[PDB]
Amino acid sequence: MNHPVESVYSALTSILLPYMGEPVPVQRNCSCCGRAPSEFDGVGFELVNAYRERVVHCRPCQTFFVSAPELMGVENPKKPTTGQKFGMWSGVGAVINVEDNSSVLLAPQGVVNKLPEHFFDHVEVITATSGQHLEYLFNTELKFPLIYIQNFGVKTYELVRSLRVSLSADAIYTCADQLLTRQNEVLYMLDLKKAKELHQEIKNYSKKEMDIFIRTVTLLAYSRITPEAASNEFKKNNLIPLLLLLPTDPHQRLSILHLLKKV
DNA sequence: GGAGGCCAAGATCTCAATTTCGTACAAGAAATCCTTTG
Ligand SMILES: [Zn+2]
């Protein structure tokens, strides 16, 4: 019940409620999310994947493998009878407001074209490419707690095991279909608050000074310029407060810079 | 007739550019020095 996949299912993937059929009583944990059957009420959906493996998917997890062409359009014309699947979308993200239980889908223009009219009635979709997810997140007033999926991808198991509720703008957890180990959440953690304050205070600096700051910090985070050189560049360009507002972590620096150069 | 395998197709996009070690030293003894000188 109170797990990350359940919220995204209720808010976003409940649109294909008609297109699964009834569950089946199961006696083994859902291989996709991995949690225990005790929170499935003893029911589950059996399935066999493209690799011929018997896998049990619970109610909110099985929705990532449902074929609903009459709702989700056709994903590949070579196979008309299998429409877009939530677990197979690559480049498509979403933002799910758990407390409101609503969802907004960030799909590129191609996917939006492939989606039928009936899809938009249940889920509001805004055309945005993979790089434009950050633009929507920055510009639009997010409502927390929320689940921000960045790349539905094709590795549905890793996607569901990477879902994490973003309790506030200080730490928005991106779910990019890559298994969110404790080693790599720095690459999937976005601090919209720090990026927002840095963007607010960057207005005081020239465009040339901006380019200089971004390039210097990027090179430093990639160890392509010595720290003394970067310090000289910051001091000569009066970029000290900007560095003071940057995280010490170089990967977070790169992430927030990537966000900055998108907005 | 079902059940393995081989292939094609699926959304657009991520940023960064590198150049050559260290310089000069030398103690009290069996030794062979020796063999003297002759
Ligand atoms: Zn599950």
Residue numbers in the entry: 1 to 263
Please quote the authors directly.
Type IV-A CRISPR-Cas systems diverge from this general mechanism, using a nuclease-independent interference pathway to suppress gene expression for gene regulation and plasmid competition. Here, we present several cryo-EM structures of two evolutionary distant type IV-A1 and type IV-A3 complexes (from Pseudomonas oleovorans and Klebsiella pneumoniae, respectively) bound to cognate DNA targets with and without DinG. The structures reveal multisubunit DNA-surveillance complexes that intimately recognize their DNA-targets to form an R-loop structure. Our results support a model in which DNA-binding is achieved analogously to type I Cascade, while recruitment of DinG differs mechanistically, even in closely related subtypes.
Cryo-EM grid optimization and exhaustive data collection yielded a sufficient amount of particles to reconstruct three structures of the DinG-bound type IV-A3 effector complex, with DinG resolved at ~3 Å to ~7 Å in three distinct states (states I–III). Similar to the type IV-A1 structure, type IV-A3 DinG is recruited to the NTS at the belly side of the complex. But unlike type IV-A1 DinG, type IV-A3 DinG contacts the palm domains of Cas5, Cas7.1 and Cas7.2 through HD2 domain α-helices 22–25, and interacts with the thumb-domain α-helices 8 and 9 of Cas7.3. Moreover, arch domain α-helices 14 and 15 are near Cas7’s WL motif, and DinG inserts its C-terminal tail into a cleft formed between Cas8’s CTD and the palm of Cas5, thereby anchoring the HD2-domain poised for NTS recruitment. Collectively, these results suggest that the interface between DinG HD2 α-helices (α22, α23) and Cas7’s palm primarily determines DinG recruitment. We next compared the three type IV-A3 DinG states, based on a structural alignment of the complexes. This revealed that the Cas8 and Cas5 contacting C-terminus, and Cas7 palm binding segments of α-helices 21 and 22 of DinG, do not rearrange between the states. Thus, the C-terminus and α-helices 21 and 22 appear to anchor DinG to the complex. The arch domain becomes stabilized in state I, as corroborated by the absence and presence of cryo-EM density in states II and I, respectively. Additionally, the arch domain rearranges and becomes stabilized in state I, as evidenced by the less pronounced cryo-EM density in state III. Examination of the cryo-EM map also revealed low local resolutions (4–7 Å) for the vFeS domain and NTS exiting the HD2 in all states.
